[PDB]
Each structure stands twice: as C-alpha cells, then as structure tokens.
Amino acid sequence: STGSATTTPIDSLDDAYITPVQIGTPAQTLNLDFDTGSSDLWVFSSETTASEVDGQTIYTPSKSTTAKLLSGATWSISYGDGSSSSGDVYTDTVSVGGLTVTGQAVESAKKVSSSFTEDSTIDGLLGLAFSTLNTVSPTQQKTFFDNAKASLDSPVFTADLGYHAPGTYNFGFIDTTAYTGSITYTAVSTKQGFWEWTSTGYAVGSGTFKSTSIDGIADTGTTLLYLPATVVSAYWAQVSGAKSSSSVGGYVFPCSATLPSFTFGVGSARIVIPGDYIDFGPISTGSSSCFGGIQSSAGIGINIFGDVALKAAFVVFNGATTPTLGFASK
Numbered sequence: 001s002t003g004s005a006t007t008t009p010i011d012s013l014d015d016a017y018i019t020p021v022q023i024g025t026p027a028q029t030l031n032l033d034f035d036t037g038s039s040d041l042w043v044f045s046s047e048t049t050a051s052e053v054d055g056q057t058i059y060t061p062s063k064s065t066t067a068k069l070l071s072g073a074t075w076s077i078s079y080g081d082g083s084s085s086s087g088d089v090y091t092d093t094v095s096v097g098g099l100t101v102t103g104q105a106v107e108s109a110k111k112v113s114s115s116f117t118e119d120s121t122i123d124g125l126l127g128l129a130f131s132t133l134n135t136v137s138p139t140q141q142k143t144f145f146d147n148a149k150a151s152l153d154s155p156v157f158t159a160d161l162g163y164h165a166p167g168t169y170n171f172g173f174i175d176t177t178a179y180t181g182s183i184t185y186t187a188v189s190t191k192q193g194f195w196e197w198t199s200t201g202y203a204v205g206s207g208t209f210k211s212t213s214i215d216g217i218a219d220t221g222t223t224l225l226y227l228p229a230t231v232v233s234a235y236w237a238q239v240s241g242a243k244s245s246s247s248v249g250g251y252v253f254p255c256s257a258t259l260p261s262f263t264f265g266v267g268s269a270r271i272v273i274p275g276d277y278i279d280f281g282p283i284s285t286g287s288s289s290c291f292g293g294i295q296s297s298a299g300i301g302i303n304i305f306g307d308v309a310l311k312a313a314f315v316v317f318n319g320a321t322t323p324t325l326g327f328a329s330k
C-alpha cells in the first residue's frame with residue numbers, strides 16, 4: 001500500500017504545517033502537525049478541558065463505531081518549546097492520504113498547554129520519530145508509520161515541505177518526479193529515538209564550504225534551524241546589523257536586509273537554503289527588526305534540522321531494518 005497527503009503551512013511564515021488525517025468511523029477529519037521529532041499521535045477531543053479548546057476541530061470517540069478505549073492507558077508529553085499535553089487513549093482506524101491503519105493508538109487530550117489552545121489551526125500531532133519515544137503508559141504504543149510499515153510497498157515516508165506553499169507527505173514510495181538530481185543517503189542513529197544524523201558541514205552565502213561534523217535531528221515539528229553557536233555566529237556576521245538579542249530570544253536582523261543563503265552538507269552533496277527561507281518577519285507587528293530562521297542550539301542540547309532546512313530538500317525517512325535518511329535538492 002501507499003498514501004499521499006498534502007501538507008499546508010498554517011500561516012504566512014511557515015510556522016508549522018498541517019496535514020488532514022481521517023480518524024474513526026465515519027471519518028472525523030482533523031488537521032495534524034506531522035512531527036518527525038516525536039512519537040505520539042494525539043488530538044484535541046471531546047474530553048479536552050473546554051476552556052482549553054479555542055477553534056480546533058475535535059475528535060469525539062463516542063461517535064466512532066470503531067473507537068475502543070485502551071483501558072488504563074494514559075499519556076503525557078512535553079515538547080522542546082515548553083508546550084505540553086496529556087490524556088487517555090483510544091484505538092481507532094486512522095487514514096492518511098489513502099493509507100489506513102486499524103487499531104492505531106489515538107491519544108485523546110484531556111489537557112493542553114496554552115500554546116496549543118492559542119493555535120486554532122493545529123488539531124493535534126502525528127509523531128513520526130521512533131516508537132521508543134512514545135509516552136503511553138503502562139503499555140507503550142506504536143507510531144502510525146511503525147504500524148503501517150509492513151503493509152507499505154517500501155518501508156519509507158518522505159517529507160516535501162513547501163516554502164510559503166503546500167507540499168506533500170508520501171508513505172510507501174519515493175516520487176522520483178519530486179526532486180532534482182539524486183538522493184544522497186546518510187546514516188541514522190536511533191539511540192535517542194530521533195532521526196539523528198551527521199551533516200558534513202556548511203557554507204554561508206557564496207562562501208567556502210567548511211567541512212565539519214554536525215550531529216542533529218531531522219525534525220519536521222520544529223520551525224527553525226538550530227545549529228552550534230559558532231556556525232550561527234558565522235552566518236549572522238554576514239548580515240549588516242544582525243545581533244543576538246537576549247530580550248527577544250535569538251538573532252534578529254534589520255528587516256531591510258537581503259539574507260544570504262545557507263548550505264548544509266549531506267555526505268558529499270549540498271542542500272542550499274535560500275536566504276528568504278531564513279526570514280521570520282517582524283519581531284512584533286510593525287517592527288523593523290526581523291526574527292532569524294537560523295538560531296543557536298546552545299542550551300537545547302541537540303542540533304535541530306527543522307523546517308527551515310527540511311523545506312529546502314526532498315527528504316526520505318527510510319525505515320528499513322537499519323534506518324537511513326535521504327536528501328535531494330528540488
């Protein structure tokens with residue numbers, strides 16, 4: 001089997017991407033944030049504290065003839081940005097772009113943090129990291145991908161995120177029309193539960209490539225590109241007036257600037273992030289100080305190839321017995 005679904009930016013900055021997901025019978029369609037940096041599929045629901053729901057579409061398990069309470073199971077997750085959610089668990093039928101999994105754990109939120117409430121466009125998350133990170137207790141549950149894998153034509157999914165435009169998540173096949181040149185594959189460590197890999201270096205603008213190993217995660221659920229302080233300083237030094245602002249929480253730059261591109265290495269191959277992709281707009285409405293899309297990972301504990309990086313590429317998440325990651329230009 002295969003599946004193919006369009007993923008759409010939630011706003012004009014590409015802060016996140018939503019993908020429609022069918023849950024239950026009859027289908028209840030929710031727009032979920034596909035997150036290769038976590039492993040829980042959780043939704044706003046009829047069980048979510050009412051004051052914490054503000055415009056989201058909810059899953060109502062009592063209206064699904066295929067929903068079953070997973071007795072005794074609870075979940076609770078905290079994300080890198082400090083957001084969180086928790087609740088109980090059902091199994092139900094879940095379909096993405098025509099690919100159906102029966103008996104998928106659907107984690108129903110009883111509580112969500114304010115950042116989730118405040119984002120009306122995201123109805124939940126669909127985790128695509130390794131199932132070892134799944135938070136359901138006392139019986140850990142599998143991701144949608146992990147459940148689908150054996151049925152797929154090939155044990156892969158691909159992320160093709162757009163810049164200010166829709167893109168695609170495919171399951172079970174590689175669309176050879178969706179990228180240019182070849183796909184370069186690179187090793188993955190699953191030891192931390194992530195799609196963790198090592199970039200071979202970087203360049204800023206038209207500058208020379210610096211060969212240096214940068215260990216990080218491919219994370220569709222993180223907006224920005226978080227890299228070591230040395231790398232980030234080298235980037236922003238090429239932008240007149242850019243500075244790190246402790247009050248704002250990262251590098252800012254004059255909105256009048258033209259940003260240079262940023263290149264990262266994948267083996268001997270190179271992915272070029274256009275300068276425009278690095279602009280996250282005014283720090284507050286009407287400001288001429290703009291927020292940068294490349295920020296320091298110091299204090300996170302890991303480098304994160306988030307959407308800023310991934311949307312410059314066609315990315316293969318190869319879930320073969322030994323997982324790997326592939327990157328192509330597009």
Ligand SMILES: COc1ccc([C@H]2SCC(=O)N2C2CC2)cc1
Nearest residue numbers: 015223248280281282283284291
């Ligand atoms: C301090 O200035 C900004 C701070 C943050 C952003 C973007 S990056 C990911 C994100 O969730 N953002 C908020 C607009 C929702 C943009 C500007």
